Structure 1
Amino acid sequence: IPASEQETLVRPKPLLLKLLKSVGAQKDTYTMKEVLFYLGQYIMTKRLYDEKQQHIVYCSNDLLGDLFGVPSFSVKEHRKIYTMIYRNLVVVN
């Protein structure tokens, strides 16, 4: 994964935008750096990870699960995370 990935400018689809609005200000275009941070903040604040197994996010009982299409995932699975995120946005140039 290149460092340039974080510079990608994106327009969230409605479900992603809904989630983002619960953790950050509503603007039209976000960087991937922004999207990752806000989704990360969402996971941390809502305690969707378990303190006894801190790499795994459980989202079966959360909007995030609908966003990503999985009951759980590992925060270490970066390629997978980017794919899950990408399906919820449009890239802009």
Structure 2
Amino acid sequence: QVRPKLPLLKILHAAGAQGEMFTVKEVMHYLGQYIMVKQLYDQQEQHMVYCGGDLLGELLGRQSFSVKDPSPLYDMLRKNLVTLA
């Protein structure tokens, strides 16, 4: 359903994704895998993600966010996913 722009594509590939065409659910899956395997979540308060000094933070223009309100990821996906025909 979607194709990611370069910085997002790099993140998904770092999480084990192949190619450049994905479903939205796949993108969400690989973003979660990325955060887990790169240990970006806060170690004591896992709802928080420290993305500063990572490509994800560069892409979001944030040092941190929380799943208490994951709106920054929504904005990023709107800007970085091309809808496929």
Q: What TM-score comes out, normalization by structure 1 length?
A: 0.80
| Correspondence 1:35-50 to 2 at 5 A | 35-50=27-42
Distance in 1 (CA, whole Å) between partners of 2:69 and 2:19 is: 28
Distance in structure 2 (CA, Å) of the matches to 1:81 and 1:19: 13
**TM (normalized to structure 2)?**
0.87
The alignment's C-alpha RMSD in Å is 1.4
Instruction: Tell me the distance in 1 between the aligned counterparts of 2:24 and 2:70.
Output: 13
Counterpart residue number, 1:33: 25
Instruction: List, as ranges, runs of 4+ consecutive aligned residues in structure 1 with deviation greater than 4 Å.
Output: none
Structure with the higher fraction of residues in strand conformation: 1
In structure 2, the gaps of 5 or more residues are none
Residues 49, 66 of structure 2: 8 Å contact kept: yes
Q: What residue is the counterpart of 2:10 in the other structure? A: 18
How far apart, CA to CA, are the structure 2 residues paired with 1:69 and 1:11? 21
Q: For this pair of structures, how many residues does the alignment match?
A: 85
> Percent same amino acid at aligned positions?
55
